[PDB]
Amino acid sequence: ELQKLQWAKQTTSICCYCAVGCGLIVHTAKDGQGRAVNVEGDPDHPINEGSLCPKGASIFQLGENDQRGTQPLYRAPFSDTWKPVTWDFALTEIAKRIKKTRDASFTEKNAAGDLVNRTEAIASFGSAAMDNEECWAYGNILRSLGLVYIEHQARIXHSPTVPALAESFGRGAMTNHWNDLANSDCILIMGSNAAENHPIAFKWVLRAKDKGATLIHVDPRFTRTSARCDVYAPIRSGADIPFLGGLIKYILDNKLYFTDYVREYTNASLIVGEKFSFKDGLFSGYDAANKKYDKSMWAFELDANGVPKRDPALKHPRCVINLLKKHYERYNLDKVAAITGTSKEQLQQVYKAYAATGKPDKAGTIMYAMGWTQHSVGVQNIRAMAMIQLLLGNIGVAGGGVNALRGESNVQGSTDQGLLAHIWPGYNPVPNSKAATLELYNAATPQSKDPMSVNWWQNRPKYVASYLKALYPDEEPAAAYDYLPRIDAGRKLTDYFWLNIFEKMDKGEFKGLFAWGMNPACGGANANKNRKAMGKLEWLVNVNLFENETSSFWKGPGMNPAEIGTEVFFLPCCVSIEKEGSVANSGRWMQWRYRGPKPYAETKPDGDIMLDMFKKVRELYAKEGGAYPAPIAKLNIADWEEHNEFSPTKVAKLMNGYFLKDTEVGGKQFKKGQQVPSFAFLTADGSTCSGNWLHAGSFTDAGNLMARRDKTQTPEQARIGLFPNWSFCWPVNRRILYNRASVDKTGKPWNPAKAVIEWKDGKWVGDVVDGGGDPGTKHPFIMQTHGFGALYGPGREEGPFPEHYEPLECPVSKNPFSKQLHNPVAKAVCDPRYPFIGTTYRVTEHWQTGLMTRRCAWLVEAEPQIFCEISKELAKLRGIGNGDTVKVSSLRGALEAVAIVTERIRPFKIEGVDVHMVGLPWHYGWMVPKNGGDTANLLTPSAGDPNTGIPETKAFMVDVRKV
Amino acid sequence: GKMFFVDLSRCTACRGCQIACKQWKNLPAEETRNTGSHQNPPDLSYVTLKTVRFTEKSRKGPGIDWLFFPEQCRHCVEPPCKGQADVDLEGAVVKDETTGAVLFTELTAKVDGESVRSACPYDIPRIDPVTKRLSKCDMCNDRVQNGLLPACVKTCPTGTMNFGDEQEMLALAEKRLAEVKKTYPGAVLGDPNDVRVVYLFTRDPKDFYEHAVA
Ligand SMILES: Nc1nc2c(c(=O)[nH]1)N[C@H]1C(S)=C(S)[C@@H](COP(=O)(O)OP(=O)(O)OC[C@H]3O[C@@H](n4cnc5c(=O)[nH]c(N)nc54)[C@H](O)[C@@H]3O)O[C@H]1N2
Ligand SMILES: Nc1nc2c(c(=O)[nH]1)N[C@H]1C(S)=C(S)[C@@H](COP(=O)(O)OP(=O)(O)OC[C@H]3O[C@@H](n4cnc5c(=O)[nH]c(N)nc54)[C@H](O)[C@@H]3O)O[C@H]1N2
Ligand code: SF4
Ligand code: SF4
Ligand code: SF4
Ligand code: SF4
Ligand SMILES: [S]
Ligand SMILES: [W+6]
């Protein structure tokens, strides 16, 4: 035996860092009673097979860390010191703060006299770090208290994705999963550094290569990913659409598209109305006054029944395919080669290698994460990837897909639970002031008159009603709909998002902020503005693992505690391996993890913190009364707790949903109290509850499917690695989305050797079919109104076809593709004292702002200090030596960093001028370690895009000087 | 006995192996500074049994050849470090009959530190300045004797790290050398008749590290 593990209890967990969702084994002392003694990889886990990157590998040192918070802490106004306090004190005083601010600032009706029932005096940040049951409970706590400013991580990195892919495929999610990468014949990594940022992914990527796949990295920098790809193609910042447009042209010119796939399963055959045109970088319906398009001009021509017209011959010149052909003829190799900085020869190499996956029995996959999709045409960057994938028949198939890599462990889950301002859980929009009734809300859902179009979103009313019944089961949904806050229809949607929360905070327009499992003092662009602006808060709640730059902004660099009047509550939360619950990985795998050791010192799961806090508010409102108490008093929290404790288990069962009385649905009978077996069996009439319709199927009468650890596979499942008995993915355990597109109209795979589904006997064998019905009797994209994979996407603000608009303001003065330089539906200074393009990115060893990993000695050991990566060309110019201290400065702030001179950075050629790019990690902050450095967000602008409301962190103007 | 096959053509320099070695033995972290490199700690020491060395080599066309070298004791079939210390004390350095692990014991405090280091062709052994004990990769002999993989091998995501019986490992190495040659035509095995840690180099081993091979 191994003495270290001999007397320890062994439990399973899921990594608390990136969205790969690697399995852990935890060993806990005194047969589970004491502290963890060991944390390493779970060798039975089908994704990581026991392997861990240094972040997963160091989770022991994250957990058993003497620097972790021990108890609630309290900072009095204008005080320069923390005072330890009890949980009883912290939560009551916070519960009073919530009620005071709310009672004062609550609004039943807006200026227009529309019912809204909200407070705009409190904002919340976070979080994708919390468990799914914690995220859902949190969303519903904040909404009962009437908040509309509810944001988290997802806004910055995964918001320009949901629309791009929803427009294209019907859903905003990663199409395949990690294990499926191994089935690809060509892997294109573009806007991703996955070897460093999703490291276990590279297990399956290199297994693709073992079976003959080509690995292509397309990055402005040569990274650890590049080191291990067959082809590295440098691209200059924001040249991605030229690159992707040139590929679309290459595919059509050389007829490398999957012809049958395109004709049947895309909208190639749909006829676009005569009012669609594109001339000189603008589409038709453009309004120069309002910098906005009238999208009604982009409508399909409809037949008598309202169904878009189709020419299956693809001959009509107003066919999507023919308009697509015409639109991308401008993107020839010479123009694309010139603007991207990628050689003509290297474009041909990458286009040939990837467009070859147009073969029915070859599959190509695209991997992108955050890259530079931050700007206003990030959504159009992604739309182009979708379109290339629909052209080559790569959507629905093994080794295909748009693999939009999620960032955090549970950012997929936290978005799914509606911790963004615009969505309730299950992506039901937050009703606006003009959705006066539940009936009006439900009338906003488009219908289709195509009998071959499933159009699943017509079921919305059953999901909204079942949702309202999980929060307010004693009320009719129709009545409960009035309890929850509404946003102004008259107001712009971005005004409720991340960056405008920082604008409003700097204008003193917020009393309280929740910084719940985030570090905005380092995470937000323009850190100096934000740190000052937090000084204009009345109260601040920070729930975190450690004291940090947010909890202690008031004693930050150049700050006088005495003058800063912000009251701060620091609540220390327990680590991932010290609580039970689920995280949803990038592949939608909702995986159950267990408690190893008991919480460290007096730390609590976020569940108990938020529940106890709300219970205090609630009993306060039973004592004092105050502003519209019905939403707080009526909230069903009894379904959340067991034995005076937040119950991950029960909350999960509620989110899945159960019948509130005896019901007949889909020709089957169900008893009161019985768990809902699928979202197919939810109702709009109040028979069913369900906190999240996507979770309906996850925790049934059969048990907790998220907790399954069964590697049983049929031959056909094992060949592509579906592992359908390993945990559970939404929707209804469909591992690969749009899989109906992977077979012909007889139900035979395009690629039988890597079949996703197959029609054998009178059934679909393999993955769960993404849409019921016999082969050739349904359109494959069931969440689409019209049912087709969209090449032409007329719901996008920027136009129905991706077009190149320069995201770089400063160093570019002319567009080679039109008269239109910048995004025509969108004032940077470009002070010549800042002649270089600063960018921020990650290293393998650190996590986010480094709040966590800067407390882990083994990660500091490998990456102890903020560095500045520059080319040999720029080191010659500013006289920088490898290792020399340098000063990186911008209009927003300045910092010191260690110079790394490397050939991995190169000058870009932009309009016959050498433009130097300098790189920084944003993993550093003033609190830890000693000599570590502060956040690169000292340098970044908080000027965002009116489209996305996301700030610039990948191309911002800096100067770099030797010290 | 047992053997490591390290296919350096699959390494992403994630440094899982580096962290994992220290988590398993609960080794302390060194004081480090960035001196214009990702490589840290800069060298092996008494508390660091494995560090990943980073080398940037120029090449025609975009990018570079980025060479990664996770360094450890080679657990030599005929250990020169033993042969040296056996003149001072037959016990300080011993060889496990079952695994072929070369193990430094507590009796290394009763030998010449530098003498045992200099005798090692790979410059592996390190000295605690306080206590004068020799430390290095011990092959996770503990774990192997209990049927577990070494921490650095289990944690590696790329298939770079491989462990098992010397018959299977020399079989894997020779078959993998053939397949990797198709991409990197100058790919070689490091001293594959003298060591139990057989690195596959994508080119001249000396580009990865001066002491990569004997
Ligand atoms: N080690 C580590 N891994 C992480 C994280 C972490 O903090 N540390 N965070 C996680 C989170 S929350 C997220 S959202 C993801 C983000 O994952 P990534 O998007 O992979 O992360 P970055 O390194 O910020 O950016 C990826 C790459 O985009 C490149 N890039 C920059 N500008 C452009 C451009 O104009 N075009 C193209 N094609 N590429 C460009 C950069 O050079 C960089 O190599 O990573 C996750 N994984
Ligand atoms: N310049 C620049 N800025 C960026 C980015 C960039 O690339 N460049 N990336 C952006 C992106 S993609 C993201 S995701 C954001 C991330 O920004 P933040 O979310 O603010 O990042 P951190 O706070 O560093 O990391 C997440 C937090 O999770 C907390 N945590 C961990 N486990 C738990 C738990 O169980 N409960 C609770 N309550 N908290 C827990 C940790 O304490 C840590 O503070 O940063 C954005 N900012
Ligand atoms: S950070 Fe991501 S890749 Fe690394 S161990 Fe955790 S889940 Fe796996
Ligand atoms: S864990 Fe494997 S891939 Fe990562 S640095 Fe070590 S040997 Fe290379
Ligand atoms: S590599 Fe050096 S220290 Fe290790 S067994 Fe060989 S001679 Fe001894
Ligand atoms: S075999 Fe064990 S001691 Fe040697 S480097 Fe690997 S983890 Fe460290
Ligand atoms: S994220
Ligand atoms: W992110």
How far out from the chain centre does Cα A916 lie? 31
**Alpha carbon distance A246, A338 (integer Å):** 12
Q: Do residues A156 and A498 lie in contact, with contact meaning Cβ atoms separated by under 8 Å? A: yes
**Alpha carbon distance A679, A463 (integer Å):** 8
Residue A206 is given by DSSP the state H
Q: How far is CA A855 from CA A57, A377, A541, A847, in A?
A: 14, 37, 21, 11
For residue A588, the distance in angstroms to the closest alpha carbon of chain B comes to 21
* Closest residue, chain B, to A341 (C-alpha): B62
Q: Do residues A961 and A887 lie in contact, with contact meaning Cβ atoms separated by under 8 Å? A: yes
Q: Which ligand is nearest to the CA of A518?
A: 2
Q: Which of B38, B48, B202 to mutate to test the interface with A (most CBs of A within 10 A)?
A: B38
Q: Do residues A188 and A216 lie in contact, with contact meaning Cβ atoms separated by under 8 Å? A: yes
The answer to whether the CB atoms of B20 and A2 lie below 8 A apart is: no
The domain that holds A249 is classified in CATH as: 3.40.228.10
Mark B59-96 as b/e (b = at least 16 C-beta within 10 Å): eeebbbebbbbbbbbbbbbebbbbebbeebeeebbbbb
B13's torsion region: left (phi>0), alpha (psi -120 to 50) or beta? left
Q: Do residues A519 and A530 lie in contact, with contact meaning Cβ atoms separated by under 8 Å? A: no
Interface check for B13 against chain A (CB to CB < 8 A): the answer is yes
Going by C-beta distance under 8 Å and a sequence separation of 6 or more, which residues neighbour residue A148? A118, A120, A421, A430, A485, A486, A487, A496
Strand order through the sheet with A589-593: A581-584, A589-593, A728-729
Q: Which of A228, A869, A880 to mutate to test the interface with B (most CBs of B within 10 A)?
A: A228
Q: B58 to chain A: which residues are within 8 Å by CB?
A: 903
Q: Do residues B101 and B144 lie in contact, with contact meaning Cβ atoms separated by under 8 Å? A: yes
Q: Do residues A400 and A363 lie in contact, with contact meaning Cβ atoms separated by under 8 Å? A: yes
Closest Cβ opposite residue A57 in set B19, B29, B38? B19
Taking a contact as any Cβ pair under 8 Å apart, which residues of chain B between 75 and 134 contact chain A? Answer: none
**Alpha carbon distance B138, A867 (integer Å):** 34
* A53 marked as binding residue: yes
Q: How far apart are the first and last CA of chain B?
A: 22
Range list of H helices, A686-822 = 715-720
Q: Do residues A109 and A381 lie in contact, with contact meaning Cβ atoms separated by under 8 Å? A: no
Q: Report the pocket of ligand 2 as residue ranges, CB < 6 Å.
A: A 16, 127, 129-130, 153, 156-157, 370, 407-408, 516-520, 523, 543-545, 573, 576, 606, 840, 848-849, 851-852, 922, 936-937, 940, 953
Interface check for B16 against chain A (CB to CB < 8 A): the answer is yes
On the 0-12 / 13-18 / 19+ scale of CB atoms within 10 A, B183 is exposed
On the 0-12 / 13-18 / 19+ scale of CB atoms within 10 A, B52 is buried
- Count Cβ atoms below 10 Å from residue A650 Cβ, excluding itself: 16
**Alpha carbon distance A362, A376 (integer Å):** 33
* B140 marked as binding residue: yes
Q: How was this structure determined?
A: X-ray
Instruction: Give which of A559, A104, A188 is closest to A366, Cα–Cα.
Output: A188
DSSP string of B77-117, one letter each residue? SS-HHHHHHTTT-TTSEEE-TTT--EEE-GGGGGS-HHHHH
Interface check for A50 against chain B (CB to CB < 8 A): the answer is yes
Q: Token pair of A791, please?
A: 């090449």
The answer to whether the CB atoms of B157 and A858 lie below 8 A apart is: no
Range of the domain at B104: 80-142
CA of A20 to the centre of ligand 3 (A): 6
Q: How far is CA A910 from CA A117, A484, A552, A812, A907, in A?
A: 52, 51, 43, 7, 9
**CB-ligand 1 contact for A191 (6 Å cutoff):** yes
Interface check for A436 against chain B (CB to CB < 8 A): the answer is no
Range of the domain at A376: 163-405
SS3 A60: helix
**Alpha carbon distance A778, A772 (integer Å):** 8
SS3 A320: helix
Cis peptide bond prior to B41, omega within 30° of 0: yes
The domain that holds B93 is classified in CATH as: 3.30.70.20
**Alpha carbon distance A8, A31 (integer Å):** 5
- Count Cβ atoms below 10 Å from residue A334 Cβ, excluding itself: 11
Interface check for A2 against chain B (CB to CB < 8 A): the answer is yes
A427's torsion region: left (phi>0), alpha (psi -120 to 50) or beta? left
Q: Whose CA is nearest to atom 1 of ligand 6?
A: B139
**Alpha carbon distance A428, A440 (integer Å):** 14
Q: Which ligand is nearest to the CA of A849?
A: 2
CA of A924 to the centre of ligand 6 (A): 30
- Count Cβ atoms below 10 Å from residue B106 Cβ, excluding itself: 11
* Closest residue, chain B, to A59 (C-alpha): B23
Residue whose entry in the numeric block shows the structure tokens 């919340």: A124
Closest Cβ opposite residue A861 in set B40, B146, B156? B40
Q: Which amino acid is present at B166? A: E
**Alpha carbon distance A514, A511 (integer Å):** 11
* B17 marked as binding residue: yes
Residue whose entry in the numeric block shows the structure tokens 């886990």: A45
Label the pairing between strands A589-593 and A581-584. antiparallel
* Closest residue, chain A, to B141 (C-alpha): A2
Q: Token pair of A313, please?
A: 């011959």
Ligand 6 atom nearest the C-alpha of B138 is: 3
Taking a contact as any Cβ pair under 8 Å apart, which residues of chain A between 514 and 553 contact chain B? Answer: none
The answer to whether the CB atoms of A1 and B146 lie below 8 A apart is: yes
Going by C-beta distance under 8 Å and a sequence separation of 6 or more, which residues neighbour residue A586? A19, A20, A21, A174, A177, A178, A198, A403, A404, A405, A406, A412
**Alpha carbon distance A846, A67 (integer Å):** 17
Ligand 5 atom nearest the C-alpha of B93 is: 8
The angle subtended at Cα B68 by Cα B66 and Cα B69, nearest 5°, is 150
**Alpha carbon distance A232, A235 (integer Å):** 10
For residue B177, the distance in angstroms to the closest alpha carbon of chain A comes to 13
Instruction: Give which of A658, A603, A158 is closest to A414, Cα–Cα.
Output: A158
Q: Token pair of A408, please?
A: 């955090």
The answer to whether the CB atoms of A862 and B19 lie below 8 A apart is: yes
Q: Do residues A152 and A518 lie in contact, with contact meaning Cβ atoms separated by under 8 Å? A: yes
Q: How far apart are the first and last CA of chain A?
A: 56
> HSE of A719 in the Cβ direction (CA atoms, 13 Å)?
14
Q: Whose CA is nearest to atom 6 of ligand 6?
A: B152
Residue A674 is given by DSSP the state P
Interface check for B147 against chain A (CB to CB < 8 A): the answer is no
Q: Whose CA is nearest to atom 10 of ligand 2?
A: A156
CA of B177 to the centre of ligand 6 (A): 24
Interface check for B60 against chain A (CB to CB < 8 A): the answer is no
* A830 marked as binding residue: no
Going by C-beta distance under 8 Å and a sequence separation of 6 or more, which residues neighbour residue B61? none
- Residue A577: enclosing H or E segment and its boundaries? none
Q: Do residues A124 and A101 lie in contact, with contact meaning Cβ atoms separated by under 8 Å? A: no
SS3 A273: coil
Residue A431 is given by DSSP the state P
Gapped junctions in chain B, after residues (C–N > 2.5 Å):
none
**CB-ligand 7 contact for A28 (6 Å cutoff):** no
**Alpha carbon distance A632, A616 (integer Å):** 11
Closest Cβ opposite residue A202 in set B12, B24, B32? B12
Q: B12 to chain A: which residues are within 8 Å by CB?
A: 195-196, 199, 202, 224-225, 227-228, 844
For residue B31, the distance in angstroms to the closest alpha carbon of chain A comes to 7
